């Protein structure tokens, strides 16, 4: 599920992100070690003048061989944008991670969905998609469309601003294979974040 | 309704507000002056790399003699929290208002809806249920306030509901008395400045002996 987001967000440190501004997921990665599991680490955090609390850690494998420990904050401590102080120490108390987080600065939406490309110009292609499901202020979401084709293929990018979930592509090379994908993120109004992953592609052949 | 919220803010400068964090209305109020209409003012604004542009002013009567001029920015210039520089000038070119704001600094939500009140216990206990204002993003960040009033000195008590939860429990209500309930919403202040919505439509209930 979020195995892809963390993989992408892996851009070692303790990394956090919110999917729909009413949640927060933090995780870190390290070499797998015999006998070491989520019971060997304490993940604590605190809201403005509220006693530190611990988060139920989780461990999961990775496509790369290191392990990932994550914590999904209870929905009650992620319903406002108050700063979150996070502190990860070994079950023995040995310090490892310490930082602060503003849920509004680490956005990472799900990829767009319902991508479809109608070839409606005996040349021009029409692309239509949907915003990441269950995501507020869709008008703030900006998109990036990928246009690739395959001899030595090529790829090109198309900016979609102000929240439009559709576009038209022209100057596409005739009789060729084209694969399209869409990814989004907040325009950075007041939302810090990163690009979502590419949507599920959709290829078409031009006449 | 735009009048509803308008009053609330007037509670005299250039006042703007956003219902859903993707819109924006600004307005000011001044004394009625013969010969003075919306054509006597210029409402300019600039954002991003956008060249300055004007907004269609409108004029309408308030409930107190003074007149209200308002601009409703296009959806296109209201799809980001980036800074916006507003500026109201008289047609003569004489400055009236100047300010820089963020759409997220002036949230004035619609009022909650569906208030249903019903008794539970027998020693004077009623529970209040309602839902957040329609088409409103980030409901989890919405706080509430319940106004509980009885009509002979009368009474009024406020219940500050938690964060996002839309339930309520009122206890210790007087005997056979008519109680009226109303809820008002405010975006918690995660990072959204603002003001309280208007009282939702009231709900009344009669208390047993």
């Amino acid at each position: 599920k979020f195995e892809s987001k963390a993989a992408l967000l892996a851009a070692e440190e303790l990394l956090c992100f919110t999917e729909r501004l009413e949640d927060l997921v933090c995780f870190w990665e390290e070499a797998a070690s015999a006998g070491v599991g989520p019971g060997n680490y304490s993940f604590s955090y605190q809201l403005e003048d509220e006693p530190w609390k611990l988060c139920r850690l989780h461990q999961a494998p990775t496509a790369r061989g290191a392990v990932r420990f994550w914590c999904s904050l209870p929905t009650a401590d992620t319903s406002s944008f108050v700063p979150l102080e996070l502190r990860v120490t070994a079950a023995s108390g040995a310090p490892r991670y310490h930082r602060v987080i503003h849920i509004n600065e680490v956005v990472l939406l799900d990829a767009p969905v319902g991508l479809v490309a109608r070839l409606a110009d005996e040349g021009h292609v029409v692309l239509r998609w949907l915003p990441p499901p269950e995501t507020p202020m869709t008008s703030h979401i900006r998109y990036e469309v990928d246009v690739s084709a395959g001899g030595a293929g090529s790829v090109q990018r198309v900016e979609i601003l102000e929240g439009r979930t559709e576009c038209v592509l022209s100057n596409l090379r005739g009789r060729t294979r084209y694969t399209f994908a869409v990814r989004a993120r907040m325009a950075e109004p007041s939302f810090g974040g990163f690009w979502s992953a590419w949507s599920e592609p959709v290829s078409l052949l031009t006449p």
Side-chain angles (χ1 to χ4, degrees), chain A:
Chain A
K1 304 175 63 179
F2 97 129
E3 198 74 58
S4 71
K5 296 199 174 181
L8 292 176
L9 183 55
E12 310 69 4
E13 320 168 359
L14 189 292
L15 302 163
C16 309
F17 71 83
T18 179
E19 303 199 313
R20 35 195 62 77
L21 301 164
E22 307 197 309
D23 51 79
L24 189 65
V25 163
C26 311
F27 69 82
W28 78 79
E29 287 162 35
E30 58 189 298
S33 192
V36 183
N40 301 61
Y41 294 109
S42 285
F43 183 102
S44 58
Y45 68 87
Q46 60 157 171
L47 302 180
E48 189 62 299
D49 175 61
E50 190 87 66
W52 288 77
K53 195 91 64 180
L54 290 170
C55 183
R56 179 192 195 188
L57 283 174
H58 298 290
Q59 177 181 48
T62 283
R64 285 179 162 65
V67 294
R68 184 175 303 141
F69 295 90
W70 52 278
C71 123
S72 184
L73 297 183
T75 188
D77 313 311
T78 58
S79 49
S80 85
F81 292 151
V82 181
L84 281 290
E85 209 187 318
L86 315 174
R87 180 171 46 65
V88 173
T89 68
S92 66
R96 285 203 61 192
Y97 296 81
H98 195 175
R99 64 182 304 199
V100 174
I101 293 293
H102 296 73
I103 295 175
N104 59 301
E105 309 185 7
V106 294
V107 191
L108 204 172
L109 302 58
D110 297 319
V113 306
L115 177 59
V116 181
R118 294 189 180 186
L119 189 52
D121 182 289
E122 306 175 359
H124 310 70
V125 174
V126 176
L127 302 179
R128 309 192 191 206
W129 59 84
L130 294 166
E134 303 164 300
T135 301
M137 297 163 53
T138 62
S139 311
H140 293 64
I141 298 173
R142 268 45 175 178
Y143 304 76
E144 182 168 295
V145 176
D146 186 277
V147 301
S148 301
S154 184
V155 312
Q156 291 177 165
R157 293 302 173 58
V158 182
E159 247 70 306
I160 312 294
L161 310 307
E162 308 178 9
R164 290 190 175 64
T165 58
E166 178 179 56
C167 76
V168 174
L169 298 175
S170 50
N171 284 66
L172 289 176
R173 300 180 186 180
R175 181 189 171 187
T176 290
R177 161 50 54 55
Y178 276 102
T179 310
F180 314 94
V182 196
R183 66 175 184 165
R185 69 170 293 159
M186 293 303 187
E188 173 47 291
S190 174
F191 297 142
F194 317 94
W195 281 108
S196 74
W198 295 111
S199 64
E200 279 305 308
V202 174
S203 297
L204 287 186
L205 291 172
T206 172

